[PDB]
Design a protein around this ligand. Structure first.
Ligand code: NAP
Ligand code: NAP
Lengths: 319, 319
């Protein structure tokens, strides 16, 4: 029978997860658990406080709350009721998050997949594979083009800025050096460039630009494009969530170079993140069905467990 | 303690494995098992008929005989004595090979990793991940331009062939269509061509050309160009072994496109194939130590098992 899934948290990721369940042959969406009473959806909405009343009805909880504080504090509680899958992206906290989720999931006999998505997630998997295969490798991850929320907020704090967004993009020159094994000395200020889009009165532009180009820690030292655009233009063309990146790994085998490159081009960040999250939710359920329990990163899941196809079918068609 | 490894077969792949074991922090090369008495190496060379007398001294056997004929009949015998790792590349025969290897490895309590390399191997893994994540997807694989080790070994076993290599060349138009999501229907056979370069007495050309064009799995049904050249021409222009390829997956999440691309650029095909085979060798030994036995494709191995580093270190650094 189908895996019974529910969504905790109805933001962008939760909405992406919801709409993609319809594309799954083997999953049924039971409901959304939200801290808000009224959501613009026909999916049943339940109080997050009542997850315990649906625990027997839910095989996998997709955790779609914010990573900043909500995941660390809430996720261990949810693991007592189902398998859980999160996209927790605070890399420096992932070992602790895994340990705490492992205690809770083990005690409950469930499987928690932590830190799925694309980074952490697919990029994590590609970093490890390429580094494992290529002895004495060089490796770089590049992000974007995508919105930087920290750098965007830094732009708005500039006196005179009415609206603003900042994007980070890979430097094409640094990408090409990485492909050739010659990026070893590049700093973060040389691997990426930045694009600013700012709404501001023209009388303030000279000051705002100099504020931007000499703002420390956020913009000093980077290649920065500064675009002053109209509020009408801003509200209409910068509401999307494009993202992606590259993982490039090289290694030498005695006078011979090898280049591994993994590229993602995403029109909608939470749509791809949800796609990854859903696949690892299938994995988590199957792992529990096999008798496993505890918490796992994407490094600990064999690839076939993500697929809705039978393993024998994958072997005959895709290997 | 280090994994004790040995190499069966001393062609291009076997030589690549040999030179790369020195790079591994956790492997020692015990020797080479060969059908030939005289190899140009200081590594201990043993008779392949005597592998049974080394069974307690060898944890992992790297199987580096030819795929076209040697692997199917010979590989299952070696699973009696150690974990094995092969790069068997006859996709239409991989389910059968896995099944017979699984019986042999299970009886012996060893782990057989079958069909490693880059295709099968890394490309198989990338096909499965991208197809599992992108629910509605288009996916195509492209190979080359470059020298194919399996096809080349197959040519050299044809009676009357003195020297031979095969190249595969992808349609760059089809690759561009794939990126735009417009290739959909095209197969590998429809988007590649094969070039053979063969040194043979002219009296043997008719028979050799027929053995090429009617060779199942490797050449039957492909667009194949056959070149009969002189030995001097071969020896100067056909020594390099570069290759590479692309796995391209596109998908839509409801009005938003995503592209996943995996790219290899290999200066020396057998060096990277060996790099992959070695990593899966590490994995097979570790799986055996965890209590597993039988035969597994690359789809069935958790990524962290390939790495020489501790899982905790990979999580903290790479996820
Ligand atoms: N690993 C990766 O590759 C990757 C990539 C992208 C994102 N992520 C993670 O995904 C997480 C969530 O992304 P998101 O874009 O979904 O964040 P979000 O849109 O801010 O949703 C976060 C939470 O805010 C609440 N919320 C949503 N709309 C609200 C409103 N109008 N008023 C009040 N509360 C509201 C929801 O909880 P209730 O329904 O309970 O209110 C939702 O769970 C991020 O924190 C990020 O770490 C991971
Ligand atoms: N899966 C992948 O991605 C991938 C990519 C590349 C290659 N491969 C596989 O790798 C396999 C090996 O490629 P290869 O280039 O190593 O094949 P090879 O160079 O033709 O040598 C293959 C076997 O022939 C024997 N041999 C070598 N030199 C010989 C000589 N001068 N006279 C007689 N016998 C000789 C060796 O066994 P003895 O020492 O016992 O004679 C060796 O094991 C290919 O068959 C291919 O299927 C896989």
């Amino acid at each position: 029978t189908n895996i019974r899934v529910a969504i905790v948290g109805y933001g962008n990721l939760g909405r992406s997860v919801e709409k993609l369940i319809a594309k799954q042959p083997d999953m049924d969406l039971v409901g959304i658990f939200s801290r808000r009473a009224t959501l613009d959806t026909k999916t049943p909405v339940f109080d997050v406080a009542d997850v315990d009343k649906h625990a027997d009805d839910v095989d996998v909880l997709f955790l779609c709350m914010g990573s900043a504080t909500d995941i660390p504090e809430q996720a261990p509680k949810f693991a007592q009721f189902a398998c859980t899958v999160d996209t927790y992206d605070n890399h420096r906290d992932i070992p602790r998050h895994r340990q705490v989720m492992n205690e809770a999931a083990t005690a409950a006999g469930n499987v928690a997949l932590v830190s799925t998505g694309w980074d952490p997630g697919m990029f994590s998997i590609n970093r490890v594979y390429a580094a494992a295969v290529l002895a004495e490798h060089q490796q770089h991850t590049f992000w974007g083009p995508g919105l930087s929320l920290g750098h965007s907020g830094a732009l708005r704090r500039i006196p005179g800025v009415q609206k603003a967004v900042q994007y980070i993009l890979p430097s094409e020159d640094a990408l090409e050096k990485a492909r050739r094994g010659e990026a070893g000395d590049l700093t973060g200020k040389q691997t990426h460039k930045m694009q600013c889009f700012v709404v501001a009165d023209a009388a303030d532009h000279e000051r705002i630009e100099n504020d931007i180009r000499t703002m420390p820690d956020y913009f000093v030292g980077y290649e920065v494009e500064v675009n002053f655009i109209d509020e009408a233009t801003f509200d209409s063309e910068h509401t999307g969530m494009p993202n992606g990146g590259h993982v490039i790994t090289t290694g030498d085998t005695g006078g011979f170079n090898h280049t591994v490159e993994y590229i993602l081009k995403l029109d909608r960040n939470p749509d791809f993140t949800a796609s990854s999250q859903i696949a690892f939710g299938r994995a988590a359920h199957r792992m529990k069905q096999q008798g496993q329990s505890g918490a796992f990163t994407v490094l600990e899941v064999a690839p076939y467990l993500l697929s809705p196809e039978n393993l024998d079918d994958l072997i005959a068609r895709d290997v």
